[PDB]
């Protein structure tokens, strides 16, 4: 009956909000993310704070995606265009030394101009079968796969595009809330929430089917889905133990080049020496089976039906049917049908090599991966799986949107806006002089 | 100009502090000064009082301490009272304007009907 | 450090106002615009809060009282156990309703006070 | 600081030149308030003392006297309806220092 | 001593000023005009000086129109690799095969493989083609002499919508509400607004289409009516209906000009043959001119007035230019302006390469529009120049004139709320 | 009611005082400029000791050289637009005096003999 | 910026696209710096004043100087250097003192 | 006893780096305040005003050059012979080259002719008159459209709000250290962005005697800037009437090229008065000997490189001179003529990845300039040679007396009076 309105400023409250985060620390992200990180990052535990977090509705995922695409293109743009190489190619079977046929590669010749406008020369290069298509008649007249619809740009050899961890940081007036518990599993209230200024450092790793080089779950295997009982949703399985996968290219190249402008050399495969297999990956067998069995035990808590079946992917092109890796700048497309394919010392997956890539499943452009000299061996950590569901329970190592590869790292963070003003009742009325 | 006019006062035997006021069509609050004159029956007048647009008033010696040379910015009226014995004066109001280093009570109101009695 | 008292009741959280007041102000043609827009907006938000405190007559204060009574329909909770037994987040939700009304009342109250100070122009 | 009227009489029955004066105690100089009060026209001012001529007033007035203890009001012959008594009211301090009536006629 | 300085804030004064106004209200005119508009304060005893000429609002609108146009056109197919000498023969339509304005041109275009060169053909308007030299079958497109041109993307419409210009905070727009205001000088009925009424960015030359009407009589506005070298804007108080058309069905084809780029070109012409014409009522037009002349005689009394056709080089200054749908029309107005003081056909031509605003380097290629087109517009004003009997001719400006004629009543001012004046009060210190 | 009563007599008027990169740059310039104008008025009022007031009285006397018109010749006679023109050449002089007065007034309160 | 740096006694003197982006950044910084200083004075309870005092005793007395040794003797630049490494221990106290003061002013037992 | 007091208008500052703006591209419109009883420590080296001028002048140059004709279509084999243009005589250094270039129709080819300087082209192989432009190898040459008017217009640099520029008025300041008679300005004097490789042109002259400035004069790793108090008049000319031709490249795009040259056979050249040079150098040497006393001093030409470090780069507009200064720097302690080479394809700001083509100046040209200083390096006895950095030395000696500081208005002090409540 005698309370008065009091105005306060500096009130510790916030609202859900969407803003632009900045990226904090010739590598692509090292160059772009020029803002240094905090040498001693702070974290403030908010005692007695419950916050409703929501994966799949979290716009940071979308923001990370858009900045990655823009940066990717900013780095690729000031490089050599391959337009003059679209001319019809005269192709034969590339020679596999003593075996004599390199299944999967063609030896092509073409008439291309050089650094001078008035000079055209016949040049040779080796190409992968996956990127070469016939014009007609089953004649040896071939086109590069993307000269039919879009520009192809060769990546500059100086740019590795290697993922480095990057940190997303709030602008003044904003804060990032982080979810703890470690049983969060998707959406809803999270207790024991802490406040940070920047994320922990996420590498922008690009893969399909399996999730590589992410964080491991602290607790048991976590199966996350917007709606685990519905189909049409990506199921992200986050493992608490990694599976080591070793992938190699058991041969090496000799690189050659063609000037196709004032400098602007085009790099192309000259010769291939080594094993006939283009590539393969080593997955320990016992590790894989234990890991998959543990995943199933957790699936059974959502899926009471016995005999869960895992099958190979159903179809589409390599961006969805095979596992994608970027090792040293080389692009591997690995066949995972040797995995899954069961009901509930190593496994070798054959792998294909591709060079003209419409990365990000874009349709208006493609990048050409220059050849890498020397042999390639990479070891990665499988930290999770991407599954698609469906009479009985069936899952497949399907593909998904790129955003799904970042949700697995960003699920624990939320952005809120600070709102310093508010009111409350008080016992005392303003005194007026 | 402001058609200032008293609408007050009567004859009285006691000096008391009878109140009277003159209203006007002017932005009195906008630095006009108020003035009152002891518009006496014969012998012209004595000053009665003065006040600022902001009050901070001062009485003429005839009333001296026994005065209330009040005015209200909100009323746009020189509503005031004073003793100075049962003075035989009508009590006239005026407004004064300032000029650098000078002032004049150029605007005069119709006088009030004050008078002495008994 | 920042929001440390956010989950606490409005005792300590009614004191760390200097903590929250600060850091509302921070310490190539593509990203350059994104960053200028972000910086300009941080400034605009800061200023809108200051302009609002200005119109309510609370400029320069962290804690300010007024001449607007509490209605009790907004909230009929007692003073005891409102400040000491509730957090600001809970309170913000409890009285999300009538926010615009409160702000309108605060502006009206100050406008009337300004008119009274304007007419009573005390000077020498 | 009271104003002491001087030359406090200017009767006439015709337009005529006239003057009045005051030994004002106040050093108001020009601000002696020589407003006058002809007839009974609410004591409307004829002049802003010796500081300025009044609006809607005759140009006849011109004493040009602005000094402590030596103030004055004066005018050229104008209307017969010009009883410019010119009683002073020096700015002084507090309420103006009204001087004796100095009754006049024209 | 008794007069002291008072500082006031919120003082109702302003000064003339020039600032940046913002736009408020797929169609290109919606782009960057995402800001909604939804008020008017009449000033008491205010007379202010207005000037429709040297009005920065007009100049600013001109720049915005160009900038938006360029942004819209920029991310589209370049027609650079079409300067190849063309092999042009006669028209191919109906049974006569002689459309005077059309040619059937064959050309060498290289496909996306940059080796398999092939020939293609399309119909072109005569106005877009220049004879290289000598005899026939050696032609160039008119633009290859100056610049490469860009075709408009079919996905974007340039059809005008009303837009409003709005002042930023701290600024206001004063509006002149005098029904007979002539464009310059004092206006004694002024209101204050934040945004303009809604102006359509309509492009035209000799005649002003789809503007506001005068609320009073017909008003003749000019910077100096005495100087025949000034443009005279005639603002009508009644509209005149003008109905234009191309009564034939245009067939479209497409060419793969490059790897992901399609060039659009004209195929066959189906129907009756005439490129274009416009329907204007005779009685309406004659009444309209008589009324205009009667007002012109106020500036040129006891002298006769005659109207003659205009004279100049490019069609942009000799014809009535307008754009309906995606077709750019260049109509002959000699039937309107041939007099001394039931309808007129106004024969009209169509062109696909348009050097808008005489920017020279920039030009748009208008893709063909399939089927037939009809449009109805409102004539709201005329543009005249002058050169006994006085001669008036259709004029036209650089497009600033078409906006001066609508924004003539607006002025931008800066608000200056801080100021001082003397008072009786001294600051209280104690 | 912005500029309501503009053109009215100053006396009455005093009672109403209460009241993609191409576009990216234009929008940012407009926003930045609006902020600068806001802050400049606040700085000038604050530096003269008039923060928070619509009407502020100072210790600077009127010179009469700037303008020799009296009360009732300015107030209840002129409009604000006319007044602004009448003394516009003394604007900076007056502002400089207001700043000096405020400096002296605050310095007088930090005095080591009295406070 | 019409500096007249001298003796501390002078307290009476206290009153294309890429290019466009750089200029906007410069304008924004001028605003940000201005506002930071004003916010800080506001938090300390010195809003609107060129000169203010507080309830904080003159600590950092290690300097061993009196008013007559600093004022009317040493310049502002010299003074700033002598205590340049103590500013950060004054700031943080000034805010607390003001915040406690405002809380005391509205207390139920003393404001009531 | 005493209380804390806070001041907002405190006249103090700190070293700072900010963005400066220009005052007269630059369409920005343009009083010094002396600060008495203050000493400010200035350092012309590691002065970010120099670094900023460098970045901005490069950016501007590029923005002005960018919207013009690309010369890429001209990278064809050229059929080159010995050029004549007048009389029965070969002009040494000029080649008459013919080539096949695509017309604006993008189909037909046309044979064109142009004259090139020997320094503009390279041979494709030996024993064959087959040439290409020096920059068809890597990157591309952008033509400078002669609307650009690249001219040494003096530009004033101005600090933004919150900042001020301090200026040093010590006549013998000599690059570093404390400076008295320091004043505050908002804008610097105008500096003409004149670019050279030695023999600094059109700068300010020293108020006092010749000043020799070096970050470390007793070193070999540092460049020595000699600032003269008197300038040497230098006159440069190309006594030839050059006639331009025009080759259409594309859709309104055209290449401007030298067609024919008539006039003198003699090559472009520069000259200075001999007595002025000998006295000027002697005065420099006296000051140099103070730094290096009891040593024999010899002047030698630079050690070698691709013209920019061996010649005097001098620019009349579109005519870039590379003059041989061995006639100036050959000595031990009435007109001296220096032959000059002319080149049309340049590296601009010593940038290897870019090139610019300067169209020819029609008719004949004469340029007259002020030599205001020297850029020298060191090589028992002492040897001095022309040398220098990447144009930083052309801003130093003008910006050397200026420093940028941030104004810091807040501060605290003790007071006698406690806050009253
Ligand atoms: C001066 O301009 C105002 C508009 O700013 C005119 O006011 C309008 O008058 C019509 C009369 O039918 C009303 O229907 C409108 O509602 C009024 N508008 C507003 C905003 O009030 C006014 O009539 C004009 N006066 C003169 C002399 O032309
Ligand atoms: C030495 C000589 O021939 N001088 C000529 C001059 O006559 C001519 O006017 C100019 C071009 O305009 O070129 C040079
Ligand atoms: C490709 O063909 C050329 C033909 O001359 C031959 O020299 C080269 O060795 C071949 N390379 C491979 C891998 O077959
Ligand atoms: C990731 O791979 C590196 C390879 O050196 C290994 O050291 C690290 O332990 C792995 N992390 C996980 C989670 O397995
Ligand atoms: C791989 O490259 C090395 C040189 O770096 C070479 O000696 C080796 O023989 C190559 N590998 C094979 C399979 O030939
Ligand atoms: C959280 O709640 C507990 C309840 O006992 C309380 O003691 C603690 O102080 C609260 N935390 C904060 C930060 O106020
Ligand atoms: C008012 O309260 C109801 C619940 O009673 C809520 O749904 C609604 O959103 C509130 N309105 C506000 C905050 O305006
Ligand atoms: C403008 O044209 C439209 C066409 O539908 C018509 O409805 C409208 O009345 C016309 N306006 C004028 C002023 O004639
Ligand atoms: C020429 O002017 C006279 C002026 O009285 C007018 O009567 C006559 O009709 C005009 N001529 C024509 C053809 O209208
Ligand atoms: C008017 O339009 C009709 C068709 O609607 C057409 O037949 C007629 O010829 C046109 N008249 C003129 C003058 O163009
Ligand atoms: C500042 O205050 C602390 C309080 O503990 C004291 O220890 C310190 O000595 C003071 N600084 C001085 C006297 O310089
Ligand atoms: C120095 O330059 C001035 C013009 O700035 C010129 O008049 C003077 O003759 C020049 N002196 C020398 C030696 O070039």
Contact F53 E9 (CB under 8 A): yes
Question: For chain D, after which residues does the C atom lie more than 2.5 Å from the next written residue's N, i.e. where is it broken?
Answer: none
DSSP string, A164-207: --BEEEPPTTEEEEE--SS---SEEEESS-EEESB---B-----
Q: Which of E84, E146, E361 sits opposite H105 (nearest CB)?
A: E84
- Distance from the CA of G41 to the center of ligand 9, in angstroms? 81
From H48, H24, H52, select the one nearest H192 (Cα to Cα): H24
Which residues have a Cβ under 8 Å from the Cβ of A268 and sit 6 or more positions away? A125, A126, A255, A256, A257, A258, A370, A371
Q: How far apart are the first and last CA of chain G?
A: 47
Find the helix packing angle between C31-55 and G17-43, rounded to 10°: 30
How many alpha carbons lie under 13 Å from residue A205 in its C-beta half-sphere? Answer: 27
Is A287 inside any structural domain? no
Backbone angles phi, psi at E164, to 5 degrees: -120, 140
Q: How far apart are the first and last CA of chain F?
A: 45
Cβ-in-10-Å burial (0-12, 13-18, 19+) of E244 comes to buried
Residue with structure tokens 């017909």? Answer: E218
Contact indicator for E383, E231 with CB cutoff of 8 Å: yes
Cα distance between residue E381 and residue E379, in whole Å: 6
CB atoms within 10 A of CB H153: 12
DSSP at E143: G
Cα distance between residue H202 and residue H372, in whole Å: 6
Nearest-CA residue for atom 11 of ligand 4: A381
Q: Could you tell me the sign of the dihedral formed by the alpha carbons of E300, E301, E303, E309, in that order?
A: positive
Residues of G in contact with A427 (CB under 8 A): 108, 111-112
Structure tokens that stand for G77 in this block: 């630049």
Is E126 found in the same domain as E18? no
Is H367 inside any structural domain? no
Is A140 found in the same domain as A196? no
- Distance from the CA of A46 to the center of ligand 6, in angstroms? 10
Q: How far is CA H98 from the centre of its chain?
A: 34
Cα distance between residue B114 and residue B89, in whole Å: 6
Cα distance between residue C12 and residue F8, in whole Å: 54
Cα distance between residue E110 and residue H37, in whole Å: 79
- Distance from the CA of C62 to the center of ligand 7, in angstroms? 28
Strands H224-248 and E327-331: unpaired
CA dihedral E104, E110, E116, E119 (to 10 degrees): 0
Question: What residues in chain A have their Cβ under 8 A from chain E's Cβ atoms?
Answer: 83-84, 86-88, 111, 143, 146-151, 364
Is A269 inside any structural domain? no
Structure tokens that stand for E297 in this block: 């005689």
Structure tokens that stand for E399 in this block: 């497009």
Is E74 found in the same domain as E5? yes
Contact indicator for B79, B71 with CB cutoff of 8 Å: yes
Is A167 found in the same domain as A146? no
Backbone angles phi, psi at E315, to 5 degrees: -60, -30
Report helix, strand or coil for B46. Answer: strand
Is E216 inside any structural domain? no
Strands H402-407 and H163-167: antiparallel
From H273, H287, H272, H297, select the one nearest H208 (Cα to Cα): H287
Contact E427 F55 (CB under 8 A): no
Cα distance between residue A63 and residue A71, in whole Å: 12
Cα distance between residue G50 and residue G47, in whole Å: 9
Residue of chain G whose Cα is closest to the Cα of A6:
G106
CA dihedral H322, H325, H327, H333 (to 10 degrees): 180
Report helix, strand or coil for G27. Answer: helix
Does the beta carbon of G63 lie inside 6 Å of ligand 11?
no
**Residue ranges per structural domain of chain F:** 10-107
Q: Residue E173 belongs to a domain with what CATH number?
A: 2.170.40.20
Contact indicator for H200, H284 with CB cutoff of 8 Å: no
DSSP string, D54-106: PTTS-TTB-----STT-EEEEE----SS-------EE--SSS-EEPP---B--
Cα distance between residue H411 and residue H10, in whole Å: 7
What atom of ligand 1 comes closest to residue E179's alpha carbon?
A: 28
Is A310 inside any structural domain? no
Does the beta carbon of E389 lie inside 6 Å of ligand 9?
no
> A360-395 burial string, b = 16+ CB within 10 Å, else e?
beeeebbbbbbbbeeebebebebbbbbbbbeeebeb
H neighbour chains, 3+ CB pairs within 8 Å: A, E, F, G
Cα distance between residue E322 and residue A384, in whole Å: 62
DSSP string, A308-345: -EE-----S-HHHHSEEEEETTEEEEE--TTSS-EE--
From E103, E107, E114, select the one nearest E85 (Cα to Cα): E107
Cα distance between residue E233 and residue H1, in whole Å: 81
What atom of ligand 9 comes closest to residue E303's alpha carbon?
A: 2
Is A385 inside any structural domain? no
Entry resolution (Å): 4.1
Decide which of A123, A139, A154 is a domain's last residue: A154
- Bridge partner list, E88: E105
**CA distances to A165, B17, B88, B114, B115 from B14, in Å:** 96, 8, 12, 12, 10
Is H134 found in the same domain as H79? yes
From H277, H288, H287, H281, select the one nearest H378 (Cα to Cα): H288
How many alpha carbons lie under 13 Å from residue E413 in its C-beta half-sphere? Answer: 23
> A14-29 burial string, b = 16+ CB within 10 Å, else e?
beeeebbbbbbeeebb
- Distance from the CA of E132 to the center of ligand 4, in angstroms? 71
Stated as kind and residue range, the H or E segment containing G43 is helix G17-43
The Cα of H318 is separated from the nearest Cα of chain A by a number of Å equal to 24
Contact indicator for A229, A302 with CB cutoff of 8 Å: yes
From H286, H352, H324, select the one nearest H198 (Cα to Cα): H324
CB atoms within 10 A of CB A232: 9
Stated as kind and residue range, the H or E segment containing A72 is helix A59-76
Cα distance between residue G28 and residue H336, in whole Å: 55
Cα distance between residue A10 and residue G98, in whole Å: 14
Is E168 found in the same domain as E72? yes
Q: How far is CA A355 from the centre of its chain?
A: 17
Is A166 found in the same domain as A93? no
**H420 CB within 8 Å of a chain F CB:** yes
- Bridge partner list, A310: A342, A395
Q: Could you tell me the sign of the dihedral formed by the alpha carbons of E253, E259, E261, E265, in that order?
A: negative
Cβ-in-10-Å burial (0-12, 13-18, 19+) of H7 comes to buried
- Count of structural domains, chain A: 2
Contact F14 B100 (CB under 8 A): no
- Bridge partner list, E49: E186
Decide which of A120, A154, A188 is a domain's last residue: A154
Structure tokens that stand for H408 in this block: 């810091």
Is E195 found in the same domain as E144? no
Q: How far is CA H367 from the centre of its chain?
A: 16
Nearest-CA residue for atom 4 of ligand 7: C97
Cβ-in-10-Å burial (0-12, 13-18, 19+) of D19 comes to middle
DSSP at F53: -
Structure tokens that stand for A118 in this block: 């008035």
Q: How far is CA E266 from the centre of its chain?
A: 26
Question: What residues in chain A have their Cβ under 8 A from chain H's Cβ atoms?
Answer: 115-119, 262-263
Q: Could you tell me the sign of the dihedral formed by the alpha carbons of H377, H378, H379, H385, in that order?
A: positive
DSSP at A216: P
DSSP string, E62-82: HHHHHHHHHHHHSSS-B-GGG
Tell me the H-state helices in E211-317.
Answer: 282-296
Show the 3-state SS of H228-244: EEEEEEEEEEEEEEEEE
Q: Which of H3, H11, H21 sits opposite G58 (nearest CB)?
A: H3
Stated as kind and residue range, the H or E segment containing D47 is strand D47-48
Which residues have a Cβ under 8 Å from the Cβ of C93 and sit 6 or more positions away? none
Residue with structure tokens 């995972």? Answer: A336
Structure tokens that stand for H19 in this block: 């963005």
Contact indicator for E329, E349 with CB cutoff of 8 Å: yes
From F63, D66, B57, select the one nearest E1 (Cα to Cα): F63
Question: What residues in chain E have their Cβ under 8 A from chain A's Cβ atoms?
Answer: 112-116, 259-260
Which residues have a Cβ under 8 Å from the Cβ of A233 and sit 6 or more positions away? A225, A226, A227, A389
DSSP string, F29-95: HHHHHHHHHHHHHHHHHHHTT-TT-SEEEEEEEP-SSS----TTTSTTT-BHHHHHHHTGGGHHHHH
Which residues have a Cβ under 8 Å from the Cβ of H406 and sit 6 or more positions away? H13, H14, H15, H16, H18, H162, H163
Is E136 found in the same domain as E45? no
Residue of chain A whose Cα is closest to the Cα of C106:
A5
Chains F and B touch (3+ CB pairs under 8 A): yes
Is A74 found in the same domain as A87? no
Contact indicator for E259, A147 with CB cutoff of 8 Å: yes
Report helix, strand or coil for H275. Answer: helix
Cβ-in-10-Å burial (0-12, 13-18, 19+) of G65 comes to middle
DSSP at A88: P
Domain hosting residue H188, numbered range: 1-70+140-193+401-421
Contact indicator for A34, A432 with CB cutoff of 8 Å: no
Chains A and D touch (3+ CB pairs under 8 A): no
Sheet with B80-82, edge to edge strand ranges: B19-20, B80-82, B67-68
Chain F 50-69, CB below 8 Å of chain G: which residues? 51-52
Cα distance between residue H200 and residue H208, in whole Å: 18
How many alpha carbons lie under 13 Å from residue E319 in its C-beta half-sphere? Answer: 20
Stated as kind and residue range, the H or E segment containing G53 is strand G51-57
From D100, D64, D57, D65, select the one nearest D82 (Cα to Cα): D57
Cα distance between residue H8 and residue C18, in whole Å: 20
Report helix, strand or coil for A161. Answer: coil
Is A9 inside any structural domain? yes
Cα distance between residue A47 and residue A58, in whole Å: 24
Residue with structure tokens 């004063």? Answer: E174
Nearest-CA residue for atom 9 of ligand 8: E378
Report helix, strand or coil for H236. Answer: strand
Contact indicator for A25, A36 with CB cutoff of 8 Å: yes
Is H134 found in the same domain as H14? no
Is H86 found in the same domain as H60? no
Cα distance between residue A7 and residue C50, in whole Å: 12
Stated as kind and residue range, the H or E segment containing E270 is strand E261-271
- Bridge partner list, E411: E174
CB atoms within 10 A of CB H208: 12
Q: How far apart are the first and last CA of chain D?
A: 31
**CA distances to A370, F78, H35, H166 from H32, in Å:** 60, 42, 10, 10
Residues of F in contact with E9 (CB under 8 A): 17, 41, 45, 50, 53-56
Is E301 inside any structural domain? no
């Amino acid at each position: 009956e005698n309370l008065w309105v009091t105005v306060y400023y500096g009130v510790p409250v916030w609202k859900d909000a969407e803003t632009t985060l900045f990226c904090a620390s010739h590598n692509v992200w090292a160059t772009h993310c020029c803002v240094p990180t905090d040498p001693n990052p702070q974290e403030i535990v908010l005692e007695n704070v419950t916050e409703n977090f929501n994966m799949w509705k979290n716009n940071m995922v979308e923001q990370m995606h858009e900045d990655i695409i823009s940066l990717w293109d900013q780095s690729l743009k000031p490089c050599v265009k391959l337009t003059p190489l679209c001319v019809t190619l005269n192709c034969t079977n590339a020679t596999a030394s003593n075996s004599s046929i390199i299944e999967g590669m063609k030896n092509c010749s073409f008439n291309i101009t050089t650094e001078l406008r008035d000079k055209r020369e016949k040049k040779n290069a080796l190409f992968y079968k996956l990127d070469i298509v016939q014009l007609d008649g089953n004649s040896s007249q071939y086109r590069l796969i993307n000269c039919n619809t879009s520009a192809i740009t060769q990546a500059c050899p100086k740019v590795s595009f290697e993922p480095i961890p990057i940190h997303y940081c709030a602008p003044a007036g904003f804060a990032i809330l982080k979810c703890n518990n470690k049983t969060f599993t998707g959406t809803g209230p999270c207790n024991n929430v802490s406040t940070v200024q920047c994320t922990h450092g996420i590498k922008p790793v690009v893969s399909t089917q399996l999730l590589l080089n992410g964080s491991l779950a602290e607790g048991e295997i976590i199966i996350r889905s917007e709606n685990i009982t519905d189909n049409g949703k990506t199921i992200l399985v986050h493992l608490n133990e990694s599976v080591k996968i070793e992938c190699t290219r058991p041969n090496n190249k000799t690189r050659t080049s063609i000037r196709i402008g004032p400098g602007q050399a085009f790099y192309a495969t000259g010769q291939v020496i080594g094993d006939i297999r283009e590539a393969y990956c080593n997955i320990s067998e016992s590790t894989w089976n234990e890991t998959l069995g543990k995943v199933v035990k957790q699936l059974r808590k959502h899926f009471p039906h016995k005999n869960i079946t895992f099958q190979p992917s159903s179809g589409g092109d390599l961006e969805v049917t095979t596992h994608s890796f970027n090792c040293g700048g080389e692009f591997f497309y690995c066949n995972t049908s040797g995995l899954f394919n069961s009901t509930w010392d190593s496994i070798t997956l054959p792998c294909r090599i591709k060079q003209i890539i419409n990365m990000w499943q874009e349709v208006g452009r493609a990048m050409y991966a220059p050849p890498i000299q020397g042999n390639i061996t990479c070891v990665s950590n499988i930290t999770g799986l991407i599954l698609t569901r469906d009479n009985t329970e069936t899952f497949r190592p399907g593909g998904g949107d790129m955003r799904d590869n970042w949700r697995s790292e960003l699920y624990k963070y939320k952005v809120v806006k600070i709102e310093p003003l508010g009111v409350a009742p008080t016992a005392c009325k303003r005194r007026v002089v | 100009x402001x058609x200032x006019x008293x609408x007050x006062x009567x004859x009285x035997x006691x000096x008391x502090x009878x109140x009277x006021x003159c209203x006007x069509x002017x932005x009195x609050x906008x630095x006009x000064x108020x003035x009152w004159x002891x518009x006496x029956x014969x012998x012209x007048x004595x000053x009665x009082x003065x006040x600022x647009x902001x009050x901070x008033x001062x009485x003429x010696x005839x009333x001296x301490x026994x005065x209330x040379x009040x005015x209200x910015x909100x009323x746009x009226x020189x509503x005031x009272x004073x003793x100075x014995x049962x003075x035989x004066x009508x009590x006239x109001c005026x407004x004064x304007x300032x000029x650098x280093x000078x002032x004049x009570x150029x605007x005069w109101x119709x006088x009030x009907x004050x008078x002495x009695x008994x | 450090g920042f929001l440390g008292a956010a989950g606490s009741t409005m005792g300590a959280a009614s004191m760390t106002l200097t903590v929250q007041a600060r850091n509302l102000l921070s310490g190539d043609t593509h990203w350059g615009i994104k960053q200028l827009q972000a910086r300009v907006l941080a400034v605009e938000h800061y200023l809108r809060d200051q302009q609002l405190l200005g119109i309510w007559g609370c400029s320069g204060k962290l804690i300010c009282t007024t001449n607007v009574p509490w209605n009790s329909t907004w909230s009929n909770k007692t003073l005891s156990e409102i400040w000491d037994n509730m957090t600001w987040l809970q309170w913000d939700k409890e009285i999300s309703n009538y926010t615009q009304i409160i702000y309108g009342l605060l502006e009206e109250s100050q406008n009337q006070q300004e008119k009274n100070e304007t007419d009573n122009l005390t000077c020498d």
